[PDB]
């Protein structure tokens, strides 16, 4: 006997570029939880239903953990896209949701069974126009781009230009494209007749990386900050040694002290050979916010007794009181399901000179 936590991440489309970190997170997560006993004896077992690229796989995806897999509690999806649309299904079902990454202002607020892990754009962007301002104090004007279809990018955009208009800097243009596109000559070109000193990007992972290539082709010799869209080493393969130096806030830190973060961290490296990324880190919380959670009931009320429409909605209650010491450092939530957070950071993409390899470096 197990207890069933549905994962509903995108593992299939342009969307797993980033959606695959998030994957590899919550299978350390399964394992570092089960090997401690899973909940008070009884071990988890994470079902994986793949939501591909859109708001229809999600909804789709969320129906049958809930129907056929008859989960406990979800955690997903990957983008903000796609919890506007297929969040209030489990909202209106009393199924907890727990976004892992999702920072569009707005996803706590969708009700009373949605929380998140990953500290919105508000909190998160500002910090890297301050980075690029510390390495270039002679900034002057910025050009922003953004994702006009994506949600998150729209939030994220705002995020960008306020801060942008706050540290006193000219918005010289904002240029609009889609996550699907591949080519940005016009918008680009566009933006460097304006002589930008920085340039910020909100998009997607593919999107964005091609953007940045291409920014460079023609001739951009600017500072870079890609959103949070832009943050895997996925993007590596797209620009190549034209991604070096894009900065990139970040909501987690490897070398962070926390005791479950050297484990957690230690068991990616092993495996991974690389630093663990944002991505699956926000995966490992939260995980590690239901496995908590569920002991923490189980002990009050045991779960074995419970039928699965209180026991989602008593579980729901307890993860919303918990305090949990996670791999993104002390968290916890507001009344609406917001999360507590203290600390933030900017990497920068440094890449060797081939092209064909690059990490990110945590600023100081
Ligand atoms: C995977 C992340 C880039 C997702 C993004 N933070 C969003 O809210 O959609
Ligand atoms: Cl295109
Ligand atoms: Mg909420």
Do not use: W
């Not at 199924?95 to 500290?119: H, L, M, Q, W």
């Not at 484990?263 to 990616?268: D, G």
Request: glycine share 8%.
């Amino acid at each position: 006997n197990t207890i069933p936590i549905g994962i509903a991440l995108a593992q299939t489309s342009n969307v797993a570029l980033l959606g695959q970190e998030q994957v590899a997170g919550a299978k350390i997560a399964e394992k570092y939880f089960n090997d401690k006993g899973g909940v008070n004896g009884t071990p988890i077992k994470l079902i994986f239903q793949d939501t591909a690229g859109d708001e229809a796989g999600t909804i789709n995806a969320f129906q049958t953990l809930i129907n056929k897999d008859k989960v406990v509690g979800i955690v997903g999806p990957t983008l903000s896209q796609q919890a506007f649309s297929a969040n209030p299904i489990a909202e209106r079902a009393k199924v907890p949701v727990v976004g892992p990454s999702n920072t569009a202002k707005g996803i706590p607020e969708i009700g009373d069974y949605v929380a998140r892990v990953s500290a919105p754009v508000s909190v998160v962007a500002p910090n890297s126009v301050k980075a690029a301002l510390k390495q270039n104090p002679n900034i002057k004007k910025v050009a922003v781009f953004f994702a006009q279809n994506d949600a998150f990018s729209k939030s994220e955009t705002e995020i960008f230009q306020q801060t942008v208009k706050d540290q006193g800097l000219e918005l010289v243009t904002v240029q609009k494209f889609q996550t699907t596109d591949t080519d940005f000559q016009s918008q680009a070109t566009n933006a460097i007749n304006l002589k930008p000193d920085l340039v910020i990007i909100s998009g997607l992972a593919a999107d964005g990386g091609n953007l940045v290539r291409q920014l460079r082709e023609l001739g951009y010799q600017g500072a870079i900050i890609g959103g949070d869209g832009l943050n895997t080493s996925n993007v590596f393969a797209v620009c190549k040694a034209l991604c070096d130096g894009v900065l990139i806030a970040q909501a987690y830190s490897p070398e962070y002290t926390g005791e479950i973060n050297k484990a957690f961290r230690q068991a990616y490296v092993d495996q991974y050979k690389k630093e663990p990324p944002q991505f699956s880190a926000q995966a490992f919380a939260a995980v590690q916010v239901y496995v908590e959670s569920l002991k923490a009931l189980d002990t009050k009320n045991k779960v074995s007794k419970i039928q699965l429409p209180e026991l989602r909605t008593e579980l729901n209650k307890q993860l919303l009181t918990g305090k949990y010491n996670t791999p993104l450092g002390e968290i916890s939530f507001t009344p609406i399901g917001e999360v507590v957070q203290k600390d933030f950071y900017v990497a920068q993409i440094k890449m060797e000179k081939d092209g064909s390899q690059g990490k990110f470096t945590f600023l100081k």
